[PDB]
Amino acid sequence: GPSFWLGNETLKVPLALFALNRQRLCERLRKNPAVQAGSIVVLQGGEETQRYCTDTGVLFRQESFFHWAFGVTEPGCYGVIDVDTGKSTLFVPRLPASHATWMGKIHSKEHFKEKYAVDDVQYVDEIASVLTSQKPSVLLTLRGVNTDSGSVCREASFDGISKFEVNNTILHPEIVECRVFKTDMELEVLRYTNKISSEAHREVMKAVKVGMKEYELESLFEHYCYSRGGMRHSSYTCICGSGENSAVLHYGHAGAPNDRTIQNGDMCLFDMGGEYYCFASDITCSFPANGKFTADQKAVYEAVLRSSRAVMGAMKPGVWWPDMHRLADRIHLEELAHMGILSGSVDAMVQAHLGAVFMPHGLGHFLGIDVHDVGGYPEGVERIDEPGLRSLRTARHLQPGMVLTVEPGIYFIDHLLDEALADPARASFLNREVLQRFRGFGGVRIEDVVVTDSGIELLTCVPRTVEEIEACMAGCD
Amino acid sequence: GPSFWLGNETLKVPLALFALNRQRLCERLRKNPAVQAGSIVVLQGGEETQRYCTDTGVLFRQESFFHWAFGVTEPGCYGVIDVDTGKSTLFVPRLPASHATWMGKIHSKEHFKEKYAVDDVQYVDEIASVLTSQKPSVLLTLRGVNTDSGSVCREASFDGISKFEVNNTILHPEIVECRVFKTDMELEVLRYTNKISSEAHREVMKAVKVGMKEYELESLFEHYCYSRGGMRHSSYTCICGSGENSAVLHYGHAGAPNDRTIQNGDMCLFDMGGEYYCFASDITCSFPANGKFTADQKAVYEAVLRSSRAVMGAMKPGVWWPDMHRLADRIHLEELAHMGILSGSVDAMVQAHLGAVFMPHGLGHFLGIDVHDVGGYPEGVERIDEPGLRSLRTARHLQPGMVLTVEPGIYFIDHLLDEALADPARASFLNREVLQRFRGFGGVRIEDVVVTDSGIELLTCVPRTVEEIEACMAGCDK
Ligand code: PRO
Ligand code: PRO
Ligand SMILES: [Mn+2]
Numbered sequence: 001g002p003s004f005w006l007g008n009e010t011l012k013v014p015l016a017l018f019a020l021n022r023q024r025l026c027e028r029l030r031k032n033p034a035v036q037a038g039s040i041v042v043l044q045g046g047e048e049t050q051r052y053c054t055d056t057g058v059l060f061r062q063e064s065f066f067h068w069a070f071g072v073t074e075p076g077c078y079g080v081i082d083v084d085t086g087k088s089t090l091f092v093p094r095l096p097a098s099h100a101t102w103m104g105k106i107h108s109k110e111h112f113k114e115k116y117a118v119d120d121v122q123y124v125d126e127i128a129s130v131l132t133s134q135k136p137s138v139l140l141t142l143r144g145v146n147t148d149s150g151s152v153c154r155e156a157s158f159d160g161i162s163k164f165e166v167n168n169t170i171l172h173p174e175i176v177e178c179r180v181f182k183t184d185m186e187l188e189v190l191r192y193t194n195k196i197s198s199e200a201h202r203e204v205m206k207a208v209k210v211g212m213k214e215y216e217l218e219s220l221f222e223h224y225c226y227s228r229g230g231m232r233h234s235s236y237t238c239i240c241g242s243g244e245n246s247a248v249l250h251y252g253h254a255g256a257p258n259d260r261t262i263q264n265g266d267m268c269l270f271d272m273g274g275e276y277y278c279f280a281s282d283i284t285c286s287f288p289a290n291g292k293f294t295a296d297q298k299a300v301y302e303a304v305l306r307s308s309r310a311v312m313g314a315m316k317p318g319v320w321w322p323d324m325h326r327l328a329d330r331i332h333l334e335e336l337a338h339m340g341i342l343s344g345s346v347d348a349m350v351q352a353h354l355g356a357v358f359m360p361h362g363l364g365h366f367l368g369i370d371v372h373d374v375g376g377y378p379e380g381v382e383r384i385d386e387p388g389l390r391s392l393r394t395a396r397h398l399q400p401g402m403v404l405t406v407e408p409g410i411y412f413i414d415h416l417l418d419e420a421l422a423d424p425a426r427a428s429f430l431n432r433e434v435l436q437r438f439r440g441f442g443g444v445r446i447e448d449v450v451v452t453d454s455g456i457e458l459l460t461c462v463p464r465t466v467e468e469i470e471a472c473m474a475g476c477d
Numbered sequence: 478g479p480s481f482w483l484g485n486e487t488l489k490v491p492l493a494l495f496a497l498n499r500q501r502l503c504e505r506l507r508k509n510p511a512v513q514a515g516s517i518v519v520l521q522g523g524e525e526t527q528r529y530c531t532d533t534g535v536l537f538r539q540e541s542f543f544h545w546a547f548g549v550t551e552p553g554c555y556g557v558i559d560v561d562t563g564k565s566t567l568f569v570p571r572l573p574a575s576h577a578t579w580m581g582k583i584h585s586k587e588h589f590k591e592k593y594a595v596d597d598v599q600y601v602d603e604i605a606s607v608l609t610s611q612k613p614s615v616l617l618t619l620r621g622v623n624t625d626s627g628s629v630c631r632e633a634s635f636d637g638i639s640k641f642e643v644n645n646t647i648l649h650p651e652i653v654e655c656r657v658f659k660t661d662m663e664l665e666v667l668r669y670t671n672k673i674s675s676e677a678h679r680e681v682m683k684a685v686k687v688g689m690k691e692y693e694l695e696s697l698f699e700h701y702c703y704s705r706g707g708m709r710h711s712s713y714t715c716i717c718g719s720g721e722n723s724a725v726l727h728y729g730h731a732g733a734p735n736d737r738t739i740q741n742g743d744m745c746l747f748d749m750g751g752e753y754y755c756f757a758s759d760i761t762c763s764f765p766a767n768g769k770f771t772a773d774q775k776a777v778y779e780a781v782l783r784s785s786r787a788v789m790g791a792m793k794p795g796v797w798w799p800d801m802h803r804l805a806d807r808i809h810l811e812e813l814a815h816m817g818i819l820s821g822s823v824d825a826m827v828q829a830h831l832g833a834v835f836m837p838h839g840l841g842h843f844l845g846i847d848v849h850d851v852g853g854y855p856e857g858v859e860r861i862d863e864p865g866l867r868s869l870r871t872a873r874h875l876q877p878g879m880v881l882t883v884e885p886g887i888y889f890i891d892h893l894l895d896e897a898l899a900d901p902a903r904a905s906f907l908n909r910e911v912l913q914r915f916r917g918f919g920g921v922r923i924e925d926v927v928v929t930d931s932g933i934e935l936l937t938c939v940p941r942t943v944e945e946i947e948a949c950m951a952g953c954d955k
């Protein structure tokens with residue numbers, strides 16, 4: 001069948017991927033006792049947007065649920081699926097003649113049917129008429145809360161939808177659950193996205209020089225990913241933190257826009273991931289700006305390497321993700337104690353939640369079409385109200401087919417350190433004379449993407465040991 | 478005073494640029510008879526957004542009017558200006574402690590005051606209280622229609638604004654008119670943006686090889702502009718049309734995403750422009766993929782070069798922009814006839830609007846903080862209901878200080894050509910035997926950015942003659 005492809009060495013993605021997702025969704029809905037026979041799933045695709053009230057077009061990126069189901073790149077579409085038969089109908093805009101002049105060829109409905117391997121293609125202005133003729137019991141629309149953003153996903157609407165019976169509660173949990181488990185075809189794309197991003201991270205590490213601006217590496221990364229990988233978008237805004245900025249978890253946004261000069265002695269923390277055909281990647285590399293770890297940098301780095309490897313090794317079906325987070329906490333504390341930053345019983349440190357002082361974020365998250373992928377907190381899965389753990393983007397048990405980031409880190413964040421030092425329950429563990437040395441150190445984060453099977457499959461491939469990193473940065477083959 | 482700067486060789490932009498804009502706006506409003514004493518301009522900045530319902534952040538780019546007045550890069554701000562005194566107050570978000578962990582240092586209000594060189598800084602949640610204490614007569618908010626998008630620019634709102642008298646009609650035309658005329662400081666930034674983009678276009682011309690995907694050059698352009706120019710954004714989505722795609726005016730959008738393989742014999746039409754600190758650039762270079770103009774390519778190209786230079790030579794104060802468009806039409810028709818594509822009286826061709834068949838878009842547009850900048854059609858300036866001219870983004874007369882693109886083009890667009898051949902009023906002018914040779918040719922567009930004075934100043938610096946282009950593509954220095 002047909003494939004998405006951007007030529008050269010980019011990945012051919014079969015449109016069968018999306019057909020399988022539609023089938024999987026129907027199969028799941030068919031098992032749901034609340035789903036009426038003759039129900040039709042109705043999804044609305046993303047529309048073109050502009051900057052505020054200007055005519056400056058924003059590059060269109062498809063809505064993630066719609067993409068998962070149809071893989072459609074064009075704006076202004078709808079897509080429906082007959083639950084009982086699995087029949088798919090794509091609705092495309094009926095374009096004006098002038099489109100030929102300004103935007104490109106006005107493709108036929110047949111062209112789109114062939115392109116996307118759907119069962120039928122109709123025009124958007126015909127959606128109410130077409131659906132009316134099918135005599136559905138109910139339209140299943142998509143409404144639910146994203147547990148990372150807290151935003152409500154708004155459901156499909158079209159002219160005349162009020163004449164139909166609409167249910168907006170059933171679909172969201174079901175399609176989310178399908179997205180949690182990646183098909184082999186989806187896994188092929190995620191192998192690719194992480195391959196390209198891994199290559200780009202290596203190129204960045206080879207290119208870093210003292211005196212460069214952080215954003216020079218952001219540019220290089222995105223350039224490698226687009227020109228060599230066909231990745232027009234990144235999965236998220238590049239985080240290129242040097243020096244103290246490596247302690248800032250989502251550094252690189254408009255408020256702190258990767259504009260610091262990399263200095264000799266700095267640690268770099270580069271968190272970047274290209275996107276291909278709306279599939280994510282997410283990799284974080286940490287390394288000395290000047291290519292040689294100091295003793296302190298080596299110690300902090302290898303502590304995070306230890307937790308990273310320990311977590312990956314321990315991941316198997318049935319493992320509770322919060323246990324992996326606590327495992328990383330314990331290892332970090334052990335290492336910080338070995339370094340002399342901490343003293344006392346590690347057991348006592350854990351009970352006092354001292355790990356969260358050094359790793360305030362979650363150990364890792366689901367990844368797929370969104371970098372922070374959906375389904376981390378389905379009904380019945382509760383967020384843990386403790387430092388560190390409350391920032392976990394899922395509290396689920398691991399199962400085969402899940403795709404997760406593994407991203408332990410250790411940071412020296414002043415307001416968290418100062419808080420702990422004011423608290424007698426935590427201050428006793430901390431050696432102020434030693435900790436003082438690490439103020440302004442920044443931080444280290446080591447992030448890989450993995451797939452759960454009988455254990456895990458590692459999708460990311462970058463230099464990780466101190467020896468590997470120093471060799472890579474010294475221009476070694 | 479302070480400057481925006483991204484280090485290395487990037488431009489230092491003094492925040493005084495924005496203070497001058499605020500001053501100019503106040504000066505204009507003070508002369509406006511309908512503006513009440515004690516009026517305060519109230520602008521709302523852009524807010525951070527995400528992809529749909531996800532937590533995937535979209536890179537924040539400031540709203541253009543707000544940027545023009547304040548040059549503020551942070552999301553979630555407001556800005557007010559006391560008309561009578563010119564006093565500026567910036568309102569910044571009161572951030573939670575956790576911001577320190579995830580986003581960066583929680584800067585003081587004093588930090589922002591020094592950074593942006595405003596008179597006062599307050600937290601956003603205090604805006605109603607602060608404004609109440611100043612006892613303004615009326616709040617001047619921003620509402621009006623963008624004449625390129627047709628969208629309504631939505632006015633500032635905050636909790637408790639209902640307690641104030643608000644006027645949303647006065648400000649928009651006045652601030653638009655200020656934006657139409659660029660200050661010396663603004664011009665320095667626009668020189669820079671067009672310099673960097675010019676350099677990037679040259680690099681693209683040196684790098685192009687048959688067999689490459691169009692998007693490889695898009696990527697190279699943006700990489701040059703960001704890494705060397707500090708241009709994190711482009712002014713618009715890159716249009717990298719090769720072969721028949723060069724006839725597609727806004728090629729490169731998601732529906733047609735620069736994914737064609739460049740072939741031997743193709744003409745390339747690359748319309749790309751980086752953005753620096755929310756100031757635009759817009760350049761279009763046209764050239765043969767293999768670095769060698771054919772006779773046909775040379776002929777079409779030099780015709781557009783002729784109209785470009787003729788328009789630039791003719792641009793003066795008092796000149797009506799639609800007349801420049803017609804001038805370009807006439808030149809294109811003359812040259813297509815000299816090529817044997819057309820035959821008969823050029824006068825008759827013009828009366829039949831034949832030019833619009835080969836150049837269906839406007840000759841050029843205002844440029845500034847937006848690539849299609851505001852103020853092309855103020856009240857009293859009407860859109861001309863004719864082919865080609867109706868697509869003009871302004872029908873104003875030129876005055877000193879305006880910044881315009883000059884972008885004539887010739888394209889071979891099948892449905893327009895076929896319409897002309899079906900039209901008895903136009904069909905006789907077309908020589909199909911010669912024209913057939915140009916089906917699938919694509920098109921040529923030559924775009925420069927200029928500033929109006931007693932004549933014009935050219936901001937763009939790229940190879941333009943056939944000789945210059947073939948030299949650039951051959952890797953020549955300078
Ligand atoms: O948001 C998260 O969960 C991870 C933590 C470091 C940055 N990204
Ligand atoms: O939109 C416009 O006015 C110009 C015409 C060619 C592409 N940009
Ligand atoms: Mn990341």
Ligand SMILES: [Mn+2]
Nearest residue numbers: 282405407447
């Ligand atoms: Mn991550």
Ligand SMILES: [Mn+2]
Nearest residue numbers: 748759760761
């Ligand atoms: Mn252009």
Ligand SMILES: [Mn+2]
Nearest residue numbers: 759882884924
């Ligand atoms: Mn233009």
Ligand SMILES: [O-]
Nearest residue numbers: 271282407447
């Ligand atoms: O991350």
